[PDB]
Amino acid sequence: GSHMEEPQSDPSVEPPLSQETFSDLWKLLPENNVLSPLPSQAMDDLMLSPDDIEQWFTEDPGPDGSCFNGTATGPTADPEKRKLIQQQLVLLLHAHKCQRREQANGEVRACSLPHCRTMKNVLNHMTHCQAGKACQVAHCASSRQIISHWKNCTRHDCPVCLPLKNASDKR
Ligand SMILES: [Zn+2]
Ligand SMILES: [Zn+2]
Ligand SMILES: [Zn+2]
């Protein structure tokens, strides 16, 4: 053929994603990234409001632990709760890459998708924010729990990390 498969088939040149990539991604990412999730393949059909993020990554309801349907009727360990983390986390990637695509090409305009518009505003605040999980903006505080997952998790076999590492196979 006209080219070789070595950059994808040989471990001496293959440049795959690292566990620290997702931690820097939402802060300092360059305008030439290739992980950009497209609406034709992204599970955006499973979308939520920023307040429901607190149902899969828990925040205290009060000092007495006053339980609710989101913890007592349908616990955080349910398989459907994991789908909601995966689909929302993949959109934090889209919202950081979509804003960069417009910076790289002034002839086009960013998404009309309210979830993309929501997350790109949160990411541009969260990079300068100092309270994080304690921030008084519900959208900032909720997104910081998602960012805190990749910062503390180091496993290969995790219901959130495994499908992301499988999708980010940039060999
Ligand atoms: Zn977008
Ligand atoms: Zn904040
Ligand atoms: Zn994990």
From Swiss-Prot:
Where Zn(2+) 2 binds, per the record, is at H125, C129, C135, C140
Q: Where does Zn(2+) 3 bind?
A: H149, C153, C158, C161
Query: Where's it found, cell-wise?
Result: Cytoplasm; Nucleus
Which positions are annotated as binding Zn(2+) 1? H94, C98, C111, C116
Q: Give the record's PTM text.
A: Methylation of the KIX domain by CARM1 blocks association with CREB. This results in the blockade of CREB signaling, and in activation of apoptotic response.
Q: Where are the zinc fingers (TAZ-type)?
A: 78-164
- What quaternary arrangement does the UniProt entry report? Part of a complex composed of MSX3, CREBBP/CBP AND EP300/p300; the interaction with MSX3 decreases histone acetylation activity. Interacts with DHX9 (via N-terminus); this interaction mediates association with RNA polymerase II holoenzyme and stimulates CREB-dependent transcriptional activation. Interacts (via transactivation domain and C-terminus) with PCNA; the interaction occurs on chromatin in UV-irradiated damaged cells. Found in a complex containing NCOA2; NCOA3; IKKA; IKKB and IKBKG. Probably part of a complex with HIF1A and EP300. The TAZ-type 1 domain interacts with HIF1A.
Q: What does this protein do?
A: Acetylates histones, giving a specific tag for transcriptional activation. Mediates acetylation of histone H3 at 'Lys-18' and 'Lys-27' (H3K18ac and H3K27ac, respectively). Also acetylates non-histone proteins, like DDX21, FBL, IRF2, MAFG, NCOA3, POLR1E/PAF53 and FOXO1. Binds specifically to phosphorylated CREB and enhances its transcriptional activity toward cAMP-responsive genes. Acts as a coactivator of ALX1. Acts as a circadian transcriptional coactivator which enhances the activity of the circadian transcriptional activators: NPAS2-BMAL1 and CLOCK-BMAL1 heterodimers.
User: What is this protein called in UniProt?
Assistant: Histone lysine acetyltransferase CREBBP
Q: Organism source for this protein?
A: Mus musculus (Mouse)
Q: Which gene encodes it?
A: Crebbp
The stretch of the full-length protein covered here is 340 to 439 of 2441
